[PDB]
Amino acid sequence: MNTYLIDPRKNNDNSGERFTVDAVDITAAAKSAAQQILGEEFEGLVYRETGESNGSGMFQAYHHLHGTNRTETTVGYPFHVMELEHH
């Protein structure tokens, strides 16, 4: 449908090379991006990182392992997310 820019900030990696993910809306793009950044191990939920401003390009992805209680929380960190150049 549409491409969305994805850049893992929490990663703290020194790789400016950002990757893009497929999606229909920023809402879904974020959920799809996290699945790649955090991996298939990510099944929690995503939410908007910013609020005071509509300026997109940032989102939050959280996930807590429920059932096995093997850990306290699977993953949970922010991540850049913005819709590629449009018309």
Side-chain angles (χ1 to χ4, degrees):
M1 188 64 245
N2 198 4
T3 15
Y4 282 73
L5 205 296
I6 321 303
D7 206 53
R9 303 294 290 288
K10 80 289 205 133
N11 262 37
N12 208 37
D13 197 34
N14 203 30
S15 63
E17 203 168 297
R18 52 257 104 74
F19 72 105
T20 68
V21 294
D22 74 89
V24 60
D25 42 53
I26 183 128
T27 335
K31 308 166 148 92
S32 272
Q35 265 175 31
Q36 190 52 264
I37 305 173
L38 298 176
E40 172 178 46
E41 289 281 14
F42 166 77
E43 274 175 40
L45 243 305
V46 74
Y47 326 100
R48 74 198 79 197
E49 170 156 5
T50 174
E52 60 209 35
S53 283
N54 287 82
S56 336
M58 297 290 265
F59 261 82
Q60 53 169 312
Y62 278 57
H63 174 40
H64 58 110
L65 208 298
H66 200 275
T68 31
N69 191 235
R70 201 271 211 77
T71 29
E72 187 186 358
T73 316
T74 12
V75 292
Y77 279 101
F79 68 118
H80 161 104
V81 153
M82 110 193 269
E83 190 181 59
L84 258 302
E85 200 158 36
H86 68 90
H87 287 278

